[PDB]
Design a protein around this nucleic acid. Structure first.
Ligand SMILES: [Mg+2]
Ligand SMILES: [Mg+2]
Ligand SMILES: [Mg+2]
Ligand SMILES: [Mg+2]
Ligand SMILES: [Mg+2]
Ligand SMILES: [Mg+2]
Lengths: 63, 64
DNA sequence: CACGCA
RNA sequence: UGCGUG
């Protein structure tokens, strides 16, 4: 669902931008009110686009 | 489902015993005619039980 | 692409 | 428990 996926990417970027430091998936699932698998589908697509990076397992930062 | 799981463990053991060597999961899925996920739930339980060993990624041998 | 994960 | 896997 692209409209949902767009909202998810929006929020991920907002939260990573406001954090200025690595953020765990556990926080992201709470911030996006979304199942972990749906967030991870978006995160790893953004990872291939070089928008976010994995600093450590299930921990994300702004690319 | 314990009846299904029992038969699946039976078939896994038959395949690994007859091979005399490590068997890939892809083989086991064809031999058992079961989805990969349900084979893996049984295989990793049998590994904890020391009935089979994981000799390399997704490759299985009889015995602990 | 290994993945079994409840 | 990292899991995204189509
Ligand atoms: Mg909107
Ligand atoms: Mg029977
Ligand atoms: Mg790998
Ligand atoms: Mg379990
Ligand atoms: Mg691990
Ligand atoms: Mg893909």
């Amino acid at each position: 669902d692209p409209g949902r996926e767009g909202h998810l990417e929006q929020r991920i970027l907002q939260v990573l931008t406001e954090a200025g430091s690595p953020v765990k998936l556990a926080q992201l699932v709470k911030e996006c009110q979304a199942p972990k698998r749906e967030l991870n589908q978006v995160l790893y697509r953004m990872k291939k686009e070089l928008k976010v990076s994995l600093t450590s397992p299930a921990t994300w930062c702004l690319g």
